[PDB]
Scaffold this active site. Structure first.
Site, mmCIF file in Angstrom:
data_model
loop_
_atom_site.group_PDB
_atom_site.id
_atom_site.type_symbol
_atom_site.label_atom_id
_atom_site.label_comp_id
_atom_site.label_asym_id
_atom_site.label_seq_id
_atom_site.Cartn_x
_atom_site.Cartn_y
_atom_site.Cartn_z
ATOM 1 N N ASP A 206 42.917 47.556 53.861
ATOM 2 C CA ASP A 206 44.145 48.535 54.447
ATOM 3 C C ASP A 206 42.691 48.251 56.099
ATOM 4 O O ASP A 206 43.427 49.273 56.480
ATOM 5 C CB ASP A 206 43.510 49.735 53.672
ATOM 6 C CG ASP A 206 44.270 49.695 52.345
ATOM 7 O OD1 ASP A 206 45.829 49.001 52.277
ATOM 8 O OD2 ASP A 206 44.168 51.144 51.009
ATOM 9 N N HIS B 221 44.386 52.990 46.772
ATOM 10 C CA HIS B 221 45.345 52.290 47.781
ATOM 11 C C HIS B 221 46.313 52.690 46.535
ATOM 12 O O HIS B 221 47.420 51.718 46.236
ATOM 13 C CB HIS B 221 44.755 51.059 47.003
ATOM 14 C CG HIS B 221 45.564 49.753 47.552
ATOM 15 N ND1 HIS B 221 44.988 49.417 48.968
ATOM 16 C CD2 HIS B 221 46.403 48.998 47.023
ATOM 17 C CE1 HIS B 221 45.879 48.792 49.180
ATOM 18 N NE2 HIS B 221 46.917 48.024 48.262
HETATM 19 N N1 LIG Z 1 44.185 45.490 46.339
HETATM 20 C C1 LIG Z 1 45.178 44.968 47.451
HETATM 21 O O1 LIG Z 1 45.154 45.267 48.673
HETATM 22 C C2 LIG Z 1 46.314 44.349 46.632
HETATM 23 C C3 LIG Z 1 47.098 43.002 48.123
HETATM 24 C C4 LIG Z 1 47.813 42.724 47.170
HETATM 25 C C5 LIG Z 1 48.422 42.793 46.860
HETATM 26 N N2 LIG Z 1 47.777 43.184 45.109
HETATM 27 C C6 LIG Z 1 48.007 42.512 43.809
HETATM 28 O O2 LIG Z 1 47.210 41.730 42.941
HETATM 29 C C7 LIG Z 1 48.159 40.819 42.201
HETATM 30 C C8 LIG Z 1 48.227 39.797 42.156
HETATM 31 O O3 LIG Z 1 49.357 39.313 43.321
HETATM 32 P P1 LIG Z 1 49.750 37.783 43.562
HETATM 33 O O4 LIG Z 1 50.756 37.946 44.328
HETATM 34 O O5 LIG Z 1 48.700 36.453 43.648
HETATM 35 O O6 LIG Z 1 50.856 37.191 42.069
HETATM 36 P P2 LIG Z 1 50.966 36.531 41.207
HETATM 37 O O7 LIG Z 1 52.034 36.479 40.398
HETATM 38 O O8 LIG Z 1 51.660 35.229 42.273
HETATM 39 O O9 LIG Z 1 49.601 35.721 40.709
HETATM 40 C C9 LIG Z 1 49.075 36.443 39.425
HETATM 41 C C10 LIG Z 1 48.508 35.332 38.615
HETATM 42 O O10 LIG Z 1 47.646 35.915 37.862
HETATM 43 C C11 LIG Z 1 47.810 34.986 36.567
HETATM 44 N N3 LIG Z 1 47.673 36.045 35.247
HETATM 45 C C12 LIG Z 1 49.444 36.599 34.391
HETATM 46 N N4 LIG Z 1 48.022 37.360 34.189
HETATM 47 C C13 LIG Z 1 47.119 36.570 33.772
HETATM 48 C C14 LIG Z 1 46.659 36.935 33.268
HETATM 49 N N5 LIG Z 1 46.848 37.559 31.543
HETATM 50 N N6 LIG Z 1 44.936 36.079 32.905
HETATM 51 C C15 LIG Z 1 44.902 34.919 33.462
HETATM 52 N N7 LIG Z 1 45.440 35.308 34.270
HETATM 53 C C16 LIG Z 1 46.980 35.991 34.596
HETATM 54 C C17 LIG Z 1 49.557 34.554 36.962
HETATM 55 O O11 LIG Z 1 49.564 33.287 36.181
HETATM 56 C C18 LIG Z 1 49.289 34.641 37.792
HETATM 57 O O12 LIG Z 1 49.018 32.963 38.405
HETATM 58 C C19 LIG Z 1 49.032 42.067 42.184
HETATM 59 O O13 LIG Z 1 49.155 43.283 40.489
HETATM 60 C C20 LIG Z 1 49.473 42.501 43.937
HETATM 61 O O14 LIG Z 1 50.021 43.865 43.780
HETATM 62 C C21 LIG Z 1 46.310 43.998 45.948
#
Ligand SMILES: NC(=O)c1ccc[n+]([C@@H]2O[C@H](COP(=O)([O-])OP(=O)(O)OC[C@H]3O[C@@H](n4cnc5c(N)ncnc54)[C@H](O)[C@@H]3O)[C@@H](O)[C@H]2O)c1
Ligand SMILES: NC(=O)c1ccc[n+]([C@@H]2O[C@H](COP(=O)([O-])OP(=O)(O)OC[C@H]3O[C@@H](n4cnc5c(N)ncnc54)[C@H](O)[C@@H]3O)[C@@H](O)[C@H]2O)c1
Ligand SMILES: N[C@@H](Cc1c[nH]c[nH+]1)C(=O)O
Ligand SMILES: [Cl-]
Ligand SMILES: [Cl-]
Ligand SMILES: [Cl-]
Lengths: 314, 314
Positions: free
Chosen positions: A150, A177
């Site tokens: 952000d 957020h």
């Molecule tokens: N805080 C922020 O500003 C911000 C910004 C962007 C995304 N996000 C969040 O971050 C998260 C991840 O996004 P992404 O684009 O990497 O998604 P993604 O689907 O591309 O990757 C998620 C990963 O998590 C893994 N995973 C799922 N369950 C698991 C478990 N129990 N143990 C270990 N690994 C596990 C999956 O296998 C995958 O590799 C989402 O929830 C998204 O909304 C937050």
């Protein structure tokens, strides 16, 4: 010499995040965890000509070994949004994921800094806290909801409108957020910037809705990844610098807070050897900004409660 | 400062490469091109708080606007290996991709440095050369087959074996980018390292087979991406610094060459304002290294002819 774990390392965020961490001389050991693909990601990264020893772990059997000795754990693990979803729509899937991974952290590296990226951040930090409390190891100075994206966004958008180098712009962003809980304090920006209210309102909306707009742009192929890797690595570097005794390191983050009636809340934090050194406060804000704070508080309380209530079920 | 295009920007290499470039103050404008997903990747990257303007382009009707005014074009576009494949199994699909894209470069930014990542490098560089000749704009000093990952691997591996900081290790790697054509000059490594022949041959094989090792480890989810992002960015930064007048910039690259009877060959190159300033050549080699070069020459010549013969079919 920082030992950093990434949980969810194989994902959209995890892979480039892990790259940026491997590229840094601040990291001596990089342990990567996921339920799929991690060995291949570790092999790839291990070839890079920097000192960090990279090691990959796959599946809950291997998770304890990924965590042992870690100074910092970062948790992008979770499902991202599709177009039309709210971050809250992710709660029911990502609650369990965060609960399970943070329980492992509580057991296997209870002294680590825990940096949660998985959405919805406004609920997943309360889950983390309550999981830690269940294991008798909660330290509120060491658990961080990563909101840096952000701030990065605010800096970029402000710089663009005033023709500044975004490297030289610092906008405090407070609250939480999600949507209207994202509260950019443009009145506190350095360098000082003057916007008329119409433009200011548009800018503030753009910051608040930025994530949703990237979701829309990716048209089903996920959410912000590369810019989150950037923002996530920034936060980790600030943290590690502070842990090494660097002075004056400040980052906004969603943390246990007594700055408002919300029990969790994002403000600028002076970081130190113990994690949070001092919560620096909201500070002096404009009328516009005060109303936004006022308007956000109910949504923040509801999201905190939802997280706390979930851990009660475990 | 530098205007860089990434052709193939949405791919496994293209996205983190684009991130590394966006993060760099050397880059003033970043233009991203792909046949899929580019608009969302550009949106994501555009939020990072650095000066580079990011713009996404999708499909061949948009390729010219990506390319206009570029100083450097990097081309990770192409299909990667699955386990069991040789890099030549990629020839039929990538030869066409490279020919089409480099033809667009020849037409819209003939003066740009062209940096080809797409495999098989030993054939795709000759393709690029012959396409540029077809358009009457071939400059041998501006076309580079990116072999930097072979150097990065060699540095890491030598550093591991000798307990050295890989940041301070520099191994020259010559020849080509496939199997036994990858020739690590451990005899010219800085700092000087002494290996008995048994460790030397093992180390040399590890370097040669490293890519195959990573394809194996990823078990069908592609080949080296994050480490290639690192190596590609490194190379591009070396080039740009040289373009900005930095002195003593040397990188190995697979280029038009007269060092051996192979018409294209990787040696250390002194880079400058016009691309290649001086081919520093092979230099003094051990008997073991001389035999590797000798044994490699047939394969390299056949790969060069393969690319050339393909452009004859267009
Ligand atoms: N805080 C922020 O500003 C911000 C910004 C962007 C995304 N996000 C969040 O971050 C998260 C991840 O996004 P992404 O684009 O990497 O998604 P993604 O689907 O591309 O990757 C998620 C990963 O998590 C893994 N995973 C799922 N369950 C698991 C478990 N129990 N143990 C270990 N690994 C596990 C999956 O296998 C995958 O590799 C989402 O929830 C998204 O909304 C937050
Ligand atoms: N030089 C090296 O050391 C080195 C190292 C690793 C990989 N590679 C090579 O790099 C290439 C890319 O690998 P990757 O892992 O990014 O693969 P990838 O399949 O994940 O990505 C390839 C990208 O190229 C794009 N693309 C395909 N055809 C295109 C076209 N006609 N025009 C524009 N874009 C197009 C795709 O849409 C995709 O976004 C492969 O050929 C791989 O073997 C080279
Ligand atoms: N030290 C160089 C990169 C490098 C060469 N060898 C190892 N690392 C800079 O960047
Ligand atoms: Cl939301
Ligand atoms: Cl606290
Ligand atoms: Cl030796």
């Amino acid at each position: 010499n920082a030992k950093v774990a990434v949980l969810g390392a194989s994902g959209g965020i995890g892979q480039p995040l892990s790259l940026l961490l491997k590229n840094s001389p601040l990291v001596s050991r990089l342990t990567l965890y996921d339920i799929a693909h991690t060995p291949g990601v570790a092999a790839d990264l291990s070839h890079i000509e920097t000192k960090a020893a990279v090691k990959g772990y796959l599946g809950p059997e291997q998770l304890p070994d990924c965590l042992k000795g870690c100074d910092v754990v970062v948790i992008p693990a979770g499902v991202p949004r599709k177009p039309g979803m709210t971050r809250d729509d992710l709660f029911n899937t990502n609650a369990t994921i965060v609960a399970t991974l943070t329980a492992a952290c509580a057991q296997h590296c209870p002294e680590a800094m825990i940096c949660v990226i998985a959405n919805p951040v406004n609920s997943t930090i309360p889950i983390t806290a309550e999981v830690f409390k269940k294991h008798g190891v909660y330290n509120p100075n060491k658990i961080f909801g990563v909101t840096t994206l952000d701030i990065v966004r605010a800096n970029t958008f402000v710089a663009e409108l005033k023709g500044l180098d975004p490297a030289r712009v610092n906008v405090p962003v407070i609250g939480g957020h999600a949507g209207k809980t994202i509260i950019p304090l443009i009145s506190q920006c350095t360098p000082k910037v003057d916007f008329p209210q119409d433009q200011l309102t548009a800018l503030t909306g753009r910051i608040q809705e930025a994530g949703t707009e990237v979701v829309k742009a990716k048209a089903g192929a996920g959410s912000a990844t590369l810019s989150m890797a950037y923002a996530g690595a920034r936060f980790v570097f600030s943290l590690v610098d502070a842990m090494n005794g660097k002075e004056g390191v400040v980052e906004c983050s969603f943390v246990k807070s007594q700055e408002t009636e919300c029990t969790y809340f994002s403000t600028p934090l002076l970081l130190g050897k113990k994690g949070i050194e001092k919560n620096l406060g909201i500070g002096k804000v404009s009328s516009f900004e005060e109303k936004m704070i006022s308007d956000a508080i109910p949504e923040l309380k509801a999201s905190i409660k939802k997280g706390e209530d979930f851990v009660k079920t475990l």
